[PDB]
Amino acid sequence: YLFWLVLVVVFVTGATRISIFGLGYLLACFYLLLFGTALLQRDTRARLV
Amino acid sequence: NHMVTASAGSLVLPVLVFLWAMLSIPRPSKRFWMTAIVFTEIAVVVKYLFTDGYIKYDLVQLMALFFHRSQLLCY
Amino acid sequence: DHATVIHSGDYFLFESDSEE
Amino acid sequence: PLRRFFHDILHTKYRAATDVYALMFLADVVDFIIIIFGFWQVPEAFLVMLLIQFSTMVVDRALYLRKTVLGKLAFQVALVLAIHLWMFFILPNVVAQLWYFVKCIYFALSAYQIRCGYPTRILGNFLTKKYNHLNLFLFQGFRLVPFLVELRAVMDWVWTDTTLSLSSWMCVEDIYANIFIIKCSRETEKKYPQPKGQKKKKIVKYGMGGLIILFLIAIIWFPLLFMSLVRSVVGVVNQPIDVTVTLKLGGYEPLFTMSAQQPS
Amino acid sequence: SWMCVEDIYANIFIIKCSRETEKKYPQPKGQKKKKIVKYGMGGLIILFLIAIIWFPLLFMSLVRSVVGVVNQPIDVTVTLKLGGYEPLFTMSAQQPSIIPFTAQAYEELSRQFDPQPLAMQFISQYSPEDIVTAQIEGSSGALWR
Amino acid sequence: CCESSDCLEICMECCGICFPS
Amino acid sequence: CCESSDCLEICMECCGICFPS
Amino acid sequence: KVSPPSLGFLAGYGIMGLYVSIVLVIGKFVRGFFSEISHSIMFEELPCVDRILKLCQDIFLVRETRELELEEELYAKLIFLYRSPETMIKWTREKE
Amino acid sequence: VDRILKLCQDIFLVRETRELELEEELYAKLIFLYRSPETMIKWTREKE
Ligand SMILES: CCCCCCCC/C=C/CCCCCCCC(=O)O[C@@H](COC(=O)CCCCCCCCCCCCCCCCC)COP(=O)(O)OCCN
Ligand SMILES: CCCCCCCCCCCC
Ligand SMILES: CCCCCCCCCCCC
Ligand SMILES: CCCCCCCCCCCC
Ligand SMILES: CCCCCCCCCCCC
Ligand SMILES: CCCCCCCCCCCC
Ligand SMILES: CCCCCCCCCCCC
Ligand SMILES: CCCCCCCCCCCC
Ligand SMILES: CCCCCCCCCCCC
Ligand SMILES: CCCCCCCCCCCC
C-alpha cells in the first residue's frame, strides 16, 4: 500500500501550497488514483516511467 | 460532507444518493460511482481555484469512493 | 344489508364446535 | 429513455418484500422530537417544521396502508428535493444537522421500501406481535402519548378498506387493545407464576404506595411551597438620590430652592 | 329514577332513528364505506387535532412577535454639573436641534464605524430614524449662581 | 365531488362518532 | 434493598393500577 | 425602540406551560371517546329498540292519566331490562 | 383472552385479503360477545 500513501501525499502537497504547482499535484493524484490499480501491478518492474 | 459544507458543495451528490443510488437495481451502477468521483474531483478543483480557505472533506470522500471502486473491482 | 348483517350475532356462533 | 427504464425497474422489477415502516416512523418520531426540542422568526420556522413533520408522517401512513410503491417513489422524490431546498431557507446549527441526519436515515429506509416492495401482510400493530413485558410497557406508553392512539385509528380507517364506520372501527380497536394488555399479563403470569397465598411482598407495596403518597403530597403541598418561595422574596433598597427642598415661600413667586444631591 | 327513564328514552330514540333510517335507505352487504365519506370525517378530525396543538402556537407567536416602537430622545439635556456646591452648566437643547437621523445619515455612521464589528452592529441594528442627533446647545447667557 | 348522499352520510356518521349510531 | 425482581413487580403493578392487570 | 409586551403572562414559560396543560386535558377529553367504547356495546348496539320505546312511552302515558301505581310497576320492568343483559338480548331481537 | 384475540386478528386478516363480507360477519361475533356477559364467561374460560 505504499504506492497509495504516496498518492495521498501527492494530493495533500497540492492542497497545502495553494499555487499552480499545487493544481498539478492535485491532478497527478486524481489520475494515479483512477489509472493506478492498473500500474500498481504493471509498473512493479515493467517500466515504472 | 453536506453536514460540514453547504450550497453547491454537496446537495448534488446527497440528492443523487437518495434518488439514484439507493433507488436502483441492486448495486447502484457504475455511472453513479463514476459521476460521484467526477463531481468530487471537480468540486476539489474549483474550490482550489477559489469560497476561500477551502476545506477538504472531499479528500476522505474521493478516497472512500475509490476504495469502494477497488472493492467492487475485486468482486 | 350491512346493518342487518352486523346485527345478526346470536348464541349459536359461540358454541364450541371444534374451534381450533 | 434511460430514466424511463430506471423507473420501470423500480416499479415492476422482481425483488423481495420487507416492512420497514416501523423504522421509518421511528426516524420521523426522533425528527419530530428534536424539532420540538429545537424551538430555539425562529418560532415561526419551528412551527412550520412541526406542521411539516406531521403532514409528511400522515402522507407516509397513507402510502403504507395503500401499499403504493409508485406513491412512495413520488413522495420520496419530492421530499428529498424539498428538504434539501429547505437547507437554503436557513434564514428564520447542531439541531438542524441532527435533523438532517435523522431525515437521511428516513430517506434511506424509505428508498429501501420502494426498491424492495410492500409485503402482503401489512396490518397489525408492531408492539402487539409478541406477548412479553417489554411489548406490554411499550404499548401502554404508546397509549399514553396524548393523541397517537386516536390519530392511528382514524388515519388507518380512512385508508384501509373497511365496511364499518369510524364508531365501529374504534370499537374493534379498543377491544383489541384491551385484549392484548390482558394477554400480556396472562402470559407473564404463566411465565413467572406467583405462589398461592404469598402476601404481596413488603417492598413492592412500599414502593407503589410510597410513590402514590408522594404524588398526592405534590398535589397539595408542593404548589404551596413553590408559591410561597417565589412570593416571599421582596425588598430592594430605595434611597432618595437627592434632597430637593424647595421652600416655596413667596405666594406669587415661590423660591428658596437651595437643595442638595447624592454627594451630600 | 326520573333521570334514569329520561336517559333510557333518549338513547332508545337515537337508536330508533338510526334503525329507521337504515330501513329507509339500506346499505348493500359488504360495500366498502365510500372513499369520500371516509375522507371527509377523517379529514375533519385530523384538522381539529391540528387546531388543538399547532393553531394555538401559531396565534400565540403571531401576537407576541409584533414588537418595536421607535423611541427617540425628544431633548438632549446635558447638565454638566460642575461646581460641587452649586452644579451648573445647564446649556442644553431640544427637538428643533435634535435631528432624527435619516436612512442616509444612518449609513454614514455605520460606515464610519464599520471596521469595528460591534460598533457598526450597534448603529446598523438600531433602525433608521432611530439614532437621534444630540445637537446640544453650548452658548450660555445664563450666568451662574 | 361531494354528493348530497355523501354529505348526509358524512354528517350522520360524525354524529355516530359522538352520539350512538 | 430493591431487587430487580421487585423492581419489575413494582413497575408492572403500577401499570396495573392504571392499565388493566 | 420600545418593546410592547403582547404576552400578558410569560411567552417563555407561563403561556407555554398553560398550553401544555391544555393539550393534555384535551387529550383526556378526546380519549374519553375512544377508550371505553366497548363497555356500552350492550346498551347501544341493540338490534330493535321498538319494545323498549313502548315501555318508555307507556310510563309517560301512565303519568298523564295519573295512574301512578302503574308507573312504579312499569319502572320495575325498565330497570330489570337494564339489570340483566341477557333479557335485553331477548327483548331487542330483530324479528321476535 | 385467547379466543377473543383470534376473533380480532381474523377481522384484521379479512381486511387485508379484502374479503369485506366476512368483516361484517366477524364484527357481528365481536359485538355479541360484548353484548352478552354470560357468553363472555363461556368463551373466556381458562381451559375450555
Ligand atoms: C412514552 C412516554 C409516555 C408519556 C408521553 C407524554 C406524557 C403525556 C401525558 C402522560 C401522563 C400520564 C398519565 C396517565 C393517566 C391515566 C389516565 C388516562 O386516561 O390515560 C389513558 C390515555 O390518556 C392520555 O391521553 C394520557 C393523559 C391523561 C391526562 C392525565 C395527565 C395529568 C395532567 C392533567 C391533569 C388533569 C387531568 C384531566 C382533567 C379532566 C380530564 C377529563 C390511558 O388509558 P386508556 O383508557 O387508553 O386504557 C385502555 C383501557 N383502559
Ligand atoms: C407507564 C406505562 C409504561 C410506559 C413506559 C414509559 C412511560 C413513561 C414512564 C416513565 C417516564 C420517565
Ligand atoms: C400513580 C402515582 C405514581 C407516581 C407519579 C408518577 C409520575 C407522574 C408525575 C407526577 C409528579 C409526582
Ligand atoms: C369531531 C371533529 C370534527 C371537526 C370538529 C367539529 C367542530 C368543533 C370545533 C373545533 C374546531 C375545529
Ligand atoms: C355538511 C357540512 C360540512 C361538514 C361539517 C363540518 C363543519 C362545518 C364546516 C363547513 C360548514 C358548511
Ligand atoms: C368551521 C369549522 C367547524 C366549526 C363548527 C362546526 C361544527 C362541526 C359539526 C360536525 C358535524 C355536524
Ligand atoms: C358555536 C356553534 C358550533 C357548534 C359547536 C360544536 C358542534 C359540533 C362539535 C361536535 C359534534 C357533536
Ligand atoms: C424503576 C423506576 C422506579 C419506579 C418508577 C418511579 C418513577 C421514576 C422515578 C425514578 C426513575 C428511575
Ligand atoms: C421523578 C418522579 C416521577 C416523574 C415521572 C416518572 C413517571 C412514573 C412512572 C410510574 C411507573 C412507570
Ligand atoms: C414527561 C415524561 C413523564 C411521563 C408522564 C407520566 C407517566 C407516568 C404517569 C402515570 C403512569 C401511567
Author numbering:
A (entry chain A): 1165 to 1213
B (entry chain A): 1698 to 1747, 1779 to 1803
C (entry chain A): 1408 to 1427
D (entry chain A): 1941 to 1980, 1999 to 2050, 2060 to 2231
E (entry chain B): 2135 to 2279
F (entry chain F), G (entry chain E): 227 to 247
H (entry chain B): 2426 to 2521
I (entry chain A): 2474 to 2521
Authors' own words:
PIEZO channels transmit mechanical force signals to cells, allowing them to make critical decisions during development and in pathophysiological conditions. MDFIC, a MyoD family inhibitor protein, has recently been identified as an auxiliary subunit of piezo channels capable of decelerating channel inactivation and attenuating channel mechanosensitivity.
The curving effect of MDFIC on hPIEZO1 further encouraged us to test if it can stabilize the unstable channelopathy mutants hPIEZO1-A1988V, hPIEZO1-E756del, and hPIEZO1-R2456H. Indeed, electrophysiological studies showed that co-expression of these channelopathy mutants with MDFIC resulted in significantly reduced mechanosensitivity and inactivation rate. Cryo-EM density maps were obtained for hPIEZO1-A1988V-MDFIC and hPIEZO1-E756del-MDFIC with overall resolutions of 3.1 and 2.8 Å, respectively. The densities of the multi-lipidated C-terminal amphipathic helix of MDFIC are clearly present in both the hPIEZO1-A1988V-MDFIC and hPIEZO1-E756del-MDFIC maps. We were surprised to find an apparent lipid density in wild-type hPIEZO1-MDFIC, hPIEZO1-A1988V-MDFIC, and even more evident in the 2.8 Å resolution map of hPIEZO1-E756del-MDFIC in the pore module, where one of its hydrophobic fatty acid tails inserts into the hydrophobic pore formed by I2447, V2450, and F2454, thus sealing the pore to prevent ion flow. Even more surprisingly, the hydrophilic phosphate head interacts directly with R2456, a residue with the more severe form of GOF mutation, on the side of the IH of the pore.
